[PDB]
């Protein structure tokens, strides 16, 4: 299917997929809502939300629903730690 530098480096394969891309997920690594099973945002999906919402501040669900933490009555906000792990590049050169 889709093979080459231009486009997805993989073909339409896999049971689970992203919610924003709706194509495929490299691996579980993708950011999955701790409350919403359907919500499936990969690395190149959460970041955009981390900056839009608050790169240095809090970052709610990349969907814009502010889904609360499973069991807990508080929204999950990426921590400085992950914020960088997913970003993989703070500089926008």
Least distance from Zn ion to the Cβ atom of residue 15, Å = 16
Question: Please, which residue, 10 or 36, has the CB nearer to Zn ion?
Answer: 36
Say how far apart CA 82 and CA 85 lie, in whole Å: 4
Identity of the residue, 25 or 83, whose beta carbon is nearer to Zn ion in the bound complex: 25
- Of 49 and 83, the one with the shorter C-beta distance to Zn ion is 49
Binding stretches for Zn ion (CB under 5 A):
18, 20-21, 33, 36, 39, 42, 45, 61, 67
Helix (H, G, I), strand (E, B) or coil at 53: helix
Question: 83 and 50 in contact (C-beta within 8 Å)?
Answer: yes
Q: Which helix (H) or strand (E) holds 31?
A: strand 31-32
């Amino acid at each position: 299917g889709s093979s080459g530098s231009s486009g997805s480096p993989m073909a339409n394969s896999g049971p689970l997929c992203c919610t924003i891309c709706h194509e495929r997920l490299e691996d579980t690594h993708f950011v999955q809502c701790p409350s919403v099973p359907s919500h499936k945002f990969c690395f190149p999906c959460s970041r955009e939300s981390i900056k839009a919402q608050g790169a240095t501040g809090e970052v709610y669900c990349p969907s814009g629903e502010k889904c609360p933490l499973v069991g807990s009555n508080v929204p999950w906000a990426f921590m400085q730690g992950e914020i960088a792990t997913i970003l993989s590049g703070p500089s926008s050169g």
